[PDB]
Design a protein around this motif. Structure first.
Motif, PDB file in Angstrom:
ATOM      1  N   UNK A   1      61.904   7.717   7.247  1.00 22.96           N
ATOM      2  CA  UNK A   1      62.438   7.706   5.889  1.00 22.96           C
ATOM      3  C   UNK A   1      61.311   7.652   4.870  1.00 22.96           C
ATOM      4  N   UNK A   2      60.191   7.039   5.250  1.00 18.30           N
ATOM      5  CA  UNK A   2      59.048   6.889   4.340  1.00 18.30           C
ATOM      6  C   UNK A   2      57.989   7.982   4.556  1.00 18.30           C
ATOM      7  N   UNK A   3      57.690   8.253   5.815  1.00 10.31           N
ATOM      8  CA  UNK A   3      56.705   9.259   6.191  1.00 10.31           C
ATOM      9  C   UNK A   3      57.410  10.563   6.563  1.00 10.31           C
ATOM     10  N   UNK A   4      57.304  11.551   5.683  1.00 10.75           N
ATOM     11  CA  UNK A   4      58.049  12.795   5.839  1.00 10.75           C
ATOM     12  C   UNK A   4      57.266  13.834   6.629  1.00 10.75           C
ATOM     13  N   UNK A   5      55.955  13.620   6.717  1.00 10.56           N
ATOM     14  CA  UNK A   5      55.091  14.490   7.497  1.00 10.56           C
ATOM     15  C   UNK A   5      54.233  13.709   8.492  1.00 10.56           C
ATOM     16  N   UNK A   6      54.798  13.400   9.668  1.00  6.20           N
ATOM     17  CA  UNK A   6      54.031  12.707  10.705  1.00  6.20           C
ATOM     18  C   UNK A   6      52.856  13.556  11.175  1.00  6.20           C
ATOM     19  N   UNK A   7      51.749  12.883  11.494  1.00  2.00           N
ATOM     20  CA  UNK A   7      50.557  13.538  12.011  1.00  2.00           C
ATOM     21  C   UNK A   7      49.789  12.532  12.868  1.00  2.00           C
ATOM     22  N   UNK A   8      49.080  13.047  13.872  1.00  2.00           N
ATOM     23  CA  UNK A   8      48.336  12.230  14.822  1.00  2.00           C
ATOM     24  C   UNK A   8      47.245  13.102  15.437  1.00  2.00           C
ATOM     25  N   UNK A   9      46.229  12.483  16.027  1.00  2.00           N
ATOM     26  CA  UNK A   9      45.085  13.247  16.551  1.00  2.00           C
ATOM     27  C   UNK A   9      45.417  14.085  17.790  1.00  2.00           C
ATOM     28  N   UNK A  10      46.482  13.725  18.502  1.00  2.00           N
ATOM     29  CA  UNK A  10      46.933  14.511  19.666  1.00  2.00           C
ATOM     30  C   UNK A  10      47.525  15.833  19.198  1.00  2.00           C
ATOM     31  N   UNK A  11      48.312  15.771  18.121  1.00  2.00           N
ATOM     32  CA  UNK A  11      48.842  16.970  17.477  1.00  2.00           C
ATOM     33  C   UNK A  11      47.689  17.833  16.957  1.00  2.00           C
ATOM     34  N   UNK A  12      46.723  17.216  16.267  1.00  6.64           N
ATOM     35  CA  UNK A  12      45.593  17.943  15.706  1.00  6.64           C
ATOM     36  C   UNK A  12      44.750  18.580  16.827  1.00  6.64           C
ATOM     37  N   UNK A  13      44.447  17.792  17.851  1.00  5.05           N
ATOM     38  CA  UNK A  13      43.746  18.282  19.044  1.00  5.05           C
ATOM     39  C   UNK A  13      44.442  19.502  19.665  1.00  5.05           C
ATOM     40  N   UNK A  14      45.753  19.404  19.883  1.00  4.98           N
ATOM     41  CA  UNK A  14      46.502  20.508  20.497  1.00  4.98           C
ATOM     42  C   UNK A  14      46.467  21.744  19.606  1.00  4.98           C
ATOM     43  N   UNK A  15      46.533  21.534  18.290  1.00  2.89           N
ATOM     44  CA  UNK A  15      46.456  22.626  17.322  1.00  2.89           C
ATOM     45  C   UNK A  15      45.098  23.340  17.356  1.00  2.89           C
ATOM     46  N   UNK A  16      44.020  22.577  17.558  1.00  2.00           N
ATOM     47  CA  UNK A  16      42.687  23.157  17.738  1.00  2.00           C
ATOM     48  C   UNK A  16      42.567  23.928  19.072  1.00  2.00           C
ATOM     49  N   UNK A  17      43.153  23.397  20.146  1.00  2.00           N
ATOM     50  CA  UNK A  17      43.135  24.048  21.470  1.00  2.00           C
ATOM     51  C   UNK A  17      43.954  25.352  21.549  1.00  2.00           C
TER      52      UNK A  17
ATOM     53  N   UNK B   1      39.315  31.360  15.791  1.00  2.00           N
ATOM     54  CA  UNK B   1      38.235  30.447  16.198  1.00  2.00           C
ATOM     55  C   UNK B   1      37.060  30.613  15.227  1.00  2.00           C
ATOM     56  N   UNK B   2      36.586  29.503  14.665  1.00  2.00           N
ATOM     57  CA  UNK B   2      35.444  29.546  13.761  1.00  2.00           C
ATOM     58  C   UNK B   2      34.401  28.513  14.176  1.00  2.00           C
ATOM     59  N   UNK B   3      33.199  28.643  13.624  1.00  2.00           N
ATOM     60  CA  UNK B   3      32.135  27.674  13.837  1.00  2.00           C
ATOM     61  C   UNK B   3      32.551  26.267  13.372  1.00  2.00           C
ATOM     62  N   UNK B   4      33.235  26.208  12.231  1.00  3.00           N
ATOM     63  CA  UNK B   4      33.695  24.950  11.651  1.00  3.00           C
ATOM     64  C   UNK B   4      34.774  24.262  12.497  1.00  3.00           C
ATOM     65  N   UNK B   5      35.730  25.040  13.016  1.00  2.00           N
ATOM     66  CA  UNK B   5      36.837  24.506  13.832  1.00  2.00           C
ATOM     67  C   UNK B   5      36.379  24.022  15.217  1.00  2.00           C
ATOM     68  N   UNK B   6      35.458  24.767  15.834  1.00  2.47           N
ATOM     69  CA  UNK B   6      34.739  24.307  17.030  1.00  2.47           C
ATOM     70  C   UNK B   6      34.046  22.969  16.755  1.00  2.47           C
ATOM     71  N   UNK B   7      33.344  22.881  15.628  1.00  2.00           N
ATOM     72  CA  UNK B   7      32.689  21.639  15.221  1.00  2.00           C
ATOM     73  C   UNK B   7      33.711  20.484  15.070  1.00  2.00           C
ATOM     74  N   UNK B   8      34.821  20.745  14.386  1.00  2.08           N
ATOM     75  CA  UNK B   8      35.858  19.724  14.191  1.00  2.08           C
ATOM     76  C   UNK B   8      36.453  19.293  15.528  1.00  2.08           C
ATOM     77  N   UNK B   9      36.525  20.225  16.477  1.00  2.00           N
ATOM     78  CA  UNK B   9      37.055  19.929  17.805  1.00  2.00           C
ATOM     79  C   UNK B   9      36.057  19.163  18.682  1.00  2.00           C
ATOM     80  N   UNK B  10      34.856  19.713  18.847  1.00  2.00           N
ATOM     81  CA  UNK B  10      33.878  19.183  19.811  1.00  2.00           C
ATOM     82  C   UNK B  10      33.018  18.057  19.260  1.00  2.00           C
TER      83      UNK B  10
END
Ligand SMILES: Cc1ccc(-c2c(C)noc2C)cc1S(=O)(=O)NC1CCCC1
Ligand SMILES: Cc1ccc(-c2c(C)noc2C)cc1S(=O)(=O)NC1CCCC1
Lengths: 114, 112
Positions: free
Chosen positions: A43-59, A3-12
């Protein structure tokens, strides 16, 4: 990770603003290539990403540094620009959300402290 | 001049400008030279490092976020115009990662 000041900021501050945005809905969960009829998507997008994934990763404390989380936001927007046709609405929706992201990132605490 | 814009000039642009993948981005897309007659039909705000650098040098920007958007427009144009499998997209992805890495360490409070 930790947990960092920056990651809290990116989350909240950054993610919360992005999440509630009127253009954000298609980005809150993974692209369902089957439910949207897009057999070529993975076939085109080899690394899917979405804000729900990012959110869960921060949590779950998955990220070790702010830039790792920023890279994930970038991948999300990049996948959208790469896969979709230039004239598609989703592209305009990503650009708008991406600009807010950069604006809010500009105001993030300068030294990453755990 | 702000603290943030000097960081973007001395740290971000310095790193990006001299990178081995930077050469296609150092000057405006020349659609005639590159044989791309539809380029300006698809891309409505062209952007490049040379422009961003010139702007940093001539104190054009009033805020760091304005320079950041230019960098971002430059990469976004590239992903939007080009085929997913083109090498230029890979080169842009690599430069943009450095951009974000450096931007994560930029001074936080923009003071003049
Ligand atoms: C519902 C949906 C969700 C995600 C996507 C998407 C994203 C995000 N990135 O690529 C695709 C494809 C596309 C769709 S969509 O089914 O193409 N609908 C779009 C019409 C305009 C806005 C939404
Ligand atoms: C020479 C060049 C310069 C700029 C671009 C370019 C950029 C930047 N953004 O869209 C295009 C098209 C493309 C090219 S290019 O002619 O497509 N050659 C590229 C292959 C991999 C590296 C160079």
């Amino acid at each position: 990770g930790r947990v960092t000041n920056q990651l809290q900021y990116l989350h909240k501050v950054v993610m919360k603003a992005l999440w509630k945005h009127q253009f954000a809905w298609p980005f809150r969960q993974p692209v369902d290539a089957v439910k949207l009829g897009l057999p070529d998507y993975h076939k085109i997008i080899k690394q899917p990403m979405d804000m729900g994934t990012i959110k869960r990763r921060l949590e779950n404390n998955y990220y070790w540094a702010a830039s790792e989380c920023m890279q994930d936001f970038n991948t999300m927007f990049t996948n959208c620009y790469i896969y979709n046709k230039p004239t598609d609405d989703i592209v305009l929706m990503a650009q708008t959300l991406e600009k807010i992201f950069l604006q809010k990132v500009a105001s993030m605490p300068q030294e990453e402290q755990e």
